[PDB]
Amino acid sequence: MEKSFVITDPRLPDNPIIFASDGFLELTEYSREEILGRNGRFLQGPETDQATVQKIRDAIRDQREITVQLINYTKSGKKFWNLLHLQPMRDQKGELQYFIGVLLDGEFIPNPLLGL
């Protein structure tokens, strides 16, 4: 694929990544073998706003779509702003099946306005 995204399986413990796009490998510098089976939180680090992490936790609990902008880190420790779009995916039976997270790299909203 082209875009940077991961798919998780919420029917398995702690919502592991079951698919990572080529774009996600390139953006994050991790190999597919380093990503499969782990939770999306591994990209976080010291500067990640815990208030934003709570917003994500609530959206996944409530199975609601959300977009947030938060600091994430590549494998080599480079900070990037991640505009992260999380969408629940339901099957034809109305049952949660996946989450997809699409990442866009950039400080789209300036930190001084994000922090207000």
Ligand SMILES: Cc1cc2nc3c(=O)[nH]c(=O)nc-3n(C[C@H](O)[C@H](O)[C@H](O)COP(=O)(O)O)c2cc1C
């Ligand atoms: C499909 C999906 C993709 C995610 N991608 C990211 C990501 O790129 N960066 C990130 O910081 N968190 C990401 N997360 C969020 C974490 O996995 C986690 O839900 C969040 O940190 C809140 O839960 P926690 O407080 O248990 O860590 C993703 C979550 C899901 C479901």
Ligand SMILES: [Cl-]
């Ligand atoms: Cl999660």
Ligand SMILES: [Co+2]
């Ligand atoms: Co591109």
Ligand SMILES: [Mg+2]
């Ligand atoms: Mg945490």
